[PDB]
CSV table of C-alpha atoms in Angstrom, one decimal:
chain,number,residue,atom,x,y,z
A,1,UNK,CA,18.0,-20.6,7.0
A,2,UNK,CA,15.7,-23.1,8.3
A,3,UNK,CA,13.4,-19.9,8.9
A,4,UNK,CA,13.3,-18.9,5.2
A,5,UNK,CA,12.2,-22.4,4.6
A,6,UNK,CA,9.6,-22.0,6.7
A,7,UNK,CA,8.6,-19.1,4.8
A,8,UNK,CA,9.2,-21.1,1.7
A,9,UNK,CA,7.0,-24.1,2.9
A,10,UNK,CA,4.5,-21.4,3.6
A,11,UNK,CA,4.1,-21.0,0.2
A,12,UNK,CA,3.7,-24.7,-1.5
A,13,UNK,CA,0.2,-24.4,-0.8
A,14,UNK,CA,-0.2,-21.1,-2.7
A,15,UNK,CA,-0.8,-21.5,-6.8
A,16,UNK,CA,-0.9,-18.4,-7.6
A,17,UNK,CA,2.6,-16.3,-8.7
A,18,UNK,CA,4.1,-14.0,-5.9
A,19,UNK,CA,6.8,-13.0,-4.1
A,20,UNK,CA,6.8,-11.6,-0.4
A,21,UNK,CA,9.8,-8.6,0.5
A,22,UNK,CA,11.5,-7.7,3.1
A,23,UNK,CA,13.2,-4.5,4.0
A,24,UNK,CA,15.4,-3.5,7.6
A,25,UNK,CA,17.3,-0.8,6.0
A,26,UNK,CA,19.8,-2.6,5.6
A,27,UNK,CA,18.9,-5.4,3.3
A,28,UNK,CA,15.7,-6.9,0.7
A,29,UNK,CA,14.5,-10.0,1.0
A,30,UNK,CA,12.3,-12.3,-1.3
A,31,UNK,CA,10.1,-15.2,-0.3
A,32,UNK,CA,7.6,-16.8,-2.6
A,33,UNK,CA,6.5,-19.0,-5.5
A,34,UNK,CA,8.2,-16.2,-8.1
A,35,UNK,CA,10.9,-14.0,-6.9
A,36,UNK,CA,11.5,-12.1,-10.1
A,37,UNK,CA,8.0,-10.1,-9.8
A,38,UNK,CA,10.4,-8.1,-6.9
A,39,UNK,CA,11.9,-6.5,-9.6
A,40,UNK,CA,9.0,-6.5,-12.3
A,41,UNK,CA,6.4,-3.1,-12.3
A,42,UNK,CA,3.0,-3.8,-12.2
A,43,UNK,CA,0.7,-1.1,-11.3
A,44,UNK,CA,0.2,0.3,-7.2
A,45,UNK,CA,-3.8,-0.1,-7.6
A,46,UNK,CA,-4.7,0.8,-4.2
A,47,UNK,CA,-1.7,1.0,-2.4
A,48,UNK,CA,-1.4,4.7,-4.0
A,49,UNK,CA,-3.3,5.8,-1.6
A,50,UNK,CA,0.2,6.3,0.8
A,51,UNK,CA,1.9,8.5,-2.0
A,52,UNK,CA,-1.7,10.6,-3.2
A,53,UNK,CA,-2.3,11.2,0.9
A,54,UNK,CA,1.0,13.0,1.4
A,55,UNK,CA,1.0,15.0,-1.9
A,56,UNK,CA,-2.6,15.4,-1.2
A,57,UNK,CA,-1.5,17.3,3.0
A,58,UNK,CA,1.6,18.2,1.3
A,59,UNK,CA,0.3,20.5,-0.7
A,60,UNK,CA,-2.6,21.5,0.8
A,61,UNK,CA,-5.8,20.5,-1.5
A,62,UNK,CA,-6.9,18.2,2.0
A,63,UNK,CA,-6.3,18.3,5.5
A,64,UNK,CA,-6.4,15.0,7.4
A,65,UNK,CA,-9.6,15.9,10.1
A,66,UNK,CA,-11.8,17.3,6.4
A,67,UNK,CA,-14.9,15.0,5.9
A,68,UNK,CA,-14.8,14.3,2.0
A,69,UNK,CA,-19.1,14.0,1.4
A,70,UNK,CA,-20.7,11.8,-0.6
A,71,UNK,CA,-22.2,13.6,-3.8
A,72,UNK,CA,-25.3,11.5,-3.4
A,73,UNK,CA,-24.2,9.0,-6.6
A,74,UNK,CA,-24.2,5.4,-5.9
A,75,UNK,CA,-20.2,4.2,-6.3
A,76,UNK,CA,-19.6,0.9,-7.5
A,77,UNK,CA,-19.7,-0.9,-3.6
A,78,UNK,CA,-22.7,0.8,-1.3
A,79,UNK,CA,-20.0,0.4,2.1
A,80,UNK,CA,-18.8,4.1,-0.2
A,81,UNK,CA,-22.2,6.0,0.1
A,82,UNK,CA,-21.4,7.5,2.6
A,83,UNK,CA,-19.1,10.3,4.1
A,84,UNK,CA,-15.4,9.9,5.3
A,85,UNK,CA,-11.8,11.1,5.7
A,86,UNK,CA,-9.3,10.2,4.4
A,87,UNK,CA,-7.9,7.5,6.7
A,88,UNK,CA,-11.6,6.2,6.9
A,89,UNK,CA,-11.5,5.7,3.3
A,90,UNK,CA,-8.1,4.9,3.5
A,91,UNK,CA,-9.2,1.7,5.6
A,92,UNK,CA,-12.1,1.7,3.5
A,93,UNK,CA,-10.4,1.3,0.0
A,94,UNK,CA,-12.7,4.5,-0.5
A,95,UNK,CA,-11.5,4.9,-4.6
A,96,UNK,CA,-14.2,7.7,-5.1
A,97,UNK,CA,-12.5,9.7,-2.3
A,98,UNK,CA,-8.9,9.5,-3.6
A,99,UNK,CA,-10.5,10.2,-7.2
A,100,UNK,CA,-11.1,13.5,-5.6
A,101,UNK,CA,-7.9,13.8,-4.4
A,102,UNK,CA,-6.5,13.5,-7.1
A,103,UNK,CA,-8.6,16.1,-9.1
A,104,UNK,CA,-7.7,18.8,-6.4
A,105,UNK,CA,-3.9,18.0,-6.9
A,106,UNK,CA,-4.3,17.8,-10.5
A,107,UNK,CA,-2.1,16.6,-13.2
A,108,UNK,CA,0.7,19.2,-13.3
A,109,UNK,CA,1.3,18.8,-9.4
A,110,UNK,CA,0.2,14.9,-9.3
A,111,UNK,CA,2.9,14.4,-12.2
A,112,UNK,CA,5.7,16.7,-10.7
A,113,UNK,CA,5.4,15.4,-7.4
A,114,UNK,CA,5.5,11.6,-8.2
A,115,UNK,CA,8.8,12.6,-10.1
A,116,UNK,CA,10.5,14.7,-7.3
A,117,UNK,CA,9.8,11.7,-5.3
A,118,UNK,CA,10.4,8.9,-7.7
A,119,UNK,CA,7.6,6.8,-7.8
A,120,UNK,CA,7.6,4.1,-9.7
A,121,UNK,CA,7.9,4.7,-12.9
A,122,UNK,CA,6.3,8.7,-12.2
A,123,UNK,CA,3.9,7.9,-15.0
A,124,UNK,CA,0.5,9.2,-15.0
A,125,UNK,CA,-0.9,10.0,-18.8
A,126,UNK,CA,-4.1,11.6,-19.2
A,127,UNK,CA,-6.3,10.6,-16.6
A,128,UNK,CA,-5.7,11.8,-13.7
A,129,UNK,CA,-7.9,10.0,-11.9
A,130,UNK,CA,-7.4,6.0,-13.3
A,131,UNK,CA,-3.9,6.3,-13.6
A,132,UNK,CA,-3.3,3.5,-10.5
A,133,UNK,CA,-5.9,1.6,-11.7
A,134,UNK,CA,-5.6,1.8,-15.2
A,135,UNK,CA,-1.7,2.3,-15.4
A,136,UNK,CA,0.4,3.9,-17.4
A,137,UNK,CA,1.9,3.9,-13.7
A,138,UNK,CA,3.5,1.1,-12.5
A,139,UNK,CA,6.1,0.1,-9.4
A,140,UNK,CA,8.1,-2.6,-8.4
A,141,UNK,CA,7.5,-4.5,-4.9
A,142,UNK,CA,10.8,-3.6,-3.3
A,143,UNK,CA,10.1,0.1,-5.0
A,144,UNK,CA,6.7,-0.2,-2.5
A,145,UNK,CA,8.6,-2.0,0.4
A,146,UNK,CA,11.2,1.1,0.5
A,147,UNK,CA,9.0,4.0,-0.2
A,148,UNK,CA,6.8,2.7,3.1
A,149,UNK,CA,9.8,1.8,5.1
A,150,UNK,CA,11.0,5.6,4.4
A,151,UNK,CA,7.4,6.4,5.3
A,152,UNK,CA,7.9,4.6,8.5
A,153,UNK,CA,10.7,6.0,9.7
A,154,UNK,CA,9.8,10.0,8.7
A,155,UNK,CA,12.3,9.9,6.3
A,156,UNK,CA,10.3,10.8,3.1
A,157,UNK,CA,10.8,13.9,1.6
A,158,UNK,CA,7.2,15.3,3.1
A,159,UNK,CA,6.5,17.3,5.9
A,160,UNK,CA,7.3,15.3,9.1
A,161,UNK,CA,3.6,15.9,10.3
A,162,UNK,CA,2.1,14.7,7.0
A,163,UNK,CA,4.1,11.6,7.3
A,164,UNK,CA,3.0,10.7,10.6
A,165,UNK,CA,-0.9,11.8,10.2
A,166,UNK,CA,-0.9,9.1,6.7
A,167,UNK,CA,1.2,6.4,8.8
A,168,UNK,CA,-1.4,6.4,11.2
A,169,UNK,CA,-4.3,5.9,8.5
A,170,UNK,CA,-2.7,2.8,7.7
A,171,UNK,CA,-2.4,1.3,11.6
A,172,UNK,CA,-3.9,-1.9,11.3
A,173,UNK,CA,-3.2,-3.6,15.1
A,174,UNK,CA,-1.1,-4.1,17.7
A,175,UNK,CA,0.6,-6.7,19.5
A,176,UNK,CA,2.3,-6.0,22.9
A,177,UNK,CA,3.9,-2.7,21.5
A,178,UNK,CA,4.7,-4.4,18.0
A,179,UNK,CA,2.5,-2.5,15.8
A,180,UNK,CA,1.2,-3.7,12.2
A,181,UNK,CA,0.7,-0.7,9.2
A,182,UNK,CA,-0.5,-2.1,6.0
A,183,UNK,CA,-2.1,-1.1,2.5
A,184,UNK,CA,-3.7,-3.8,0.2
A,185,UNK,CA,-4.7,-3.7,-2.9
A,186,UNK,CA,-6.2,-5.4,-6.0
A,187,UNK,CA,-5.7,-3.9,-9.8
A,188,UNK,CA,-8.5,-5.9,-11.4
A,189,UNK,CA,-8.6,-3.8,-14.5
A,190,UNK,CA,-5.4,-5.0,-15.7
A,191,UNK,CA,-3.9,-8.3,-17.9
A,192,UNK,CA,-2.6,-9.8,-15.4
A,193,UNK,CA,-4.7,-8.7,-12.2
A,194,UNK,CA,-2.4,-7.6,-9.6
A,195,UNK,CA,-3.0,-8.0,-5.6
A,196,UNK,CA,-0.4,-6.4,-3.1
A,197,UNK,CA,-0.3,-6.5,0.5
A,198,UNK,CA,2.4,-3.3,1.7
A,199,UNK,CA,3.5,-2.5,4.7
A,200,UNK,CA,5.5,-2.4,7.8
A,201,UNK,CA,6.0,-3.7,11.6
A,202,UNK,CA,7.1,-1.8,14.1
A,203,UNK,CA,9.0,-2.6,16.7
A,204,UNK,CA,8.8,-1.3,20.7
A,205,UNK,CA,12.4,0.0,20.2
A,206,UNK,CA,11.8,2.0,17.0
A,207,UNK,CA,12.6,-0.4,14.8
A,208,UNK,CA,11.1,-1.6,11.4
A,209,UNK,CA,10.8,-4.6,8.9
A,210,UNK,CA,8.5,-3.2,5.6
A,211,UNK,CA,7.4,-6.2,3.9
A,212,UNK,CA,5.4,-6.2,-0.1
A,213,UNK,CA,3.3,-8.7,-0.4
A,214,UNK,CA,3.4,-9.2,-4.8
A,215,UNK,CA,1.1,-12.1,-6.2
A,216,UNK,CA,-1.5,-12.7,-9.0
A,217,UNK,CA,-5.1,-12.1,-9.0
A,218,UNK,CA,-7.6,-13.9,-10.7
A,219,UNK,CA,-11.2,-13.7,-10.6
A,220,UNK,CA,-13.0,-15.2,-7.4
A,221,UNK,CA,-9.9,-15.1,-5.4
A,222,UNK,CA,-10.7,-15.2,-1.7
A,223,UNK,CA,-10.0,-11.2,-0.3
A,224,UNK,CA,-8.5,-12.2,2.6
A,225,UNK,CA,-5.2,-14.4,1.4
A,226,UNK,CA,-3.5,-11.3,1.0
A,227,UNK,CA,-3.8,-10.8,4.7
A,228,UNK,CA,-3.6,-14.1,5.9
A,229,UNK,CA,-1.0,-14.9,4.0
A,230,UNK,CA,1.4,-11.9,4.8
A,231,UNK,CA,0.2,-12.6,8.4
A,232,UNK,CA,1.4,-16.5,8.4
A,233,UNK,CA,5.1,-15.0,7.2
A,234,UNK,CA,5.3,-12.8,9.3
A,235,UNK,CA,5.0,-14.9,11.9
A,236,UNK,CA,7.2,-17.7,10.7
A,237,UNK,CA,9.9,-15.1,10.2
A,238,UNK,CA,9.7,-13.8,13.8
A,239,UNK,CA,8.4,-10.2,12.5
A,240,UNK,CA,4.8,-10.1,14.1
A,241,UNK,CA,3.8,-13.8,16.4
A,242,UNK,CA,1.1,-14.4,16.8
C-alpha cells in the first residue's frame, strides 16, 4: 500500500474533485480526491471519439485513410480549418470531423450500435452530432476503463482491423517498448464541467493497464493538467516510469 499512498499524495495538491481508475483485466482500483466519481455517469465528451471511430469504420461509413475535407466554414478553433483523416482529428480532437462521421452513421445505427456494445447509458436523444457533448449520453469512469482495456486487447465486438486502426489513432508515446495510448476530453457545455484522460499502457509482453482520470473542470483550468497528472500517477504506480 505505500505505492497507493504515494499516488494519493499527488492528489493533495489538486483542489478539484477527481478520481483515477485503473483496470488490469482482473481488478479495478480507484485513486484520488473523490472516489464515488468512479461509479458516477458523466457525459463522455471527446472520449466518445473512440466509440464513434469504431462504429464508423465497422459500418463502412469511413476508412482510416479517407480525408475529411474542410468545407470552408470557419470552425471553433482556427486549428480545425483544414483537412483531416480520422486519426489526425482524433489527436487534434477535431469535433466537426466526428460530427460529420456521426451524421453519416445516422441516429438509427448510432443508437442500435451503442446498444449492441453497452456503451454507457446508450442514450443519444434527437441530435446525432451533439449527444456526447451535451448529453443525454453518459458513462462512468469504470465503464470507460473497461471499454478501452478491451480495445487494447482487441476484445471489443468489432472487427480486429477496426480495433487496431482506432487503437493506433490513440498512440501518444513510448518509453522502451511500453506504449501509452490516450484520449482527452473536456465537456464544457454541462454543469459541472467534466474532464477526462482515458487510455492504457501496453507493456512489452502484451500486458495492459487501462486508466481513466475523471475530474471536475472549470473555466480557465490548465489544459495540460489532465495529462500531467495522469502521467505522474502512472509513474508512481510503476506502470509508466519517467
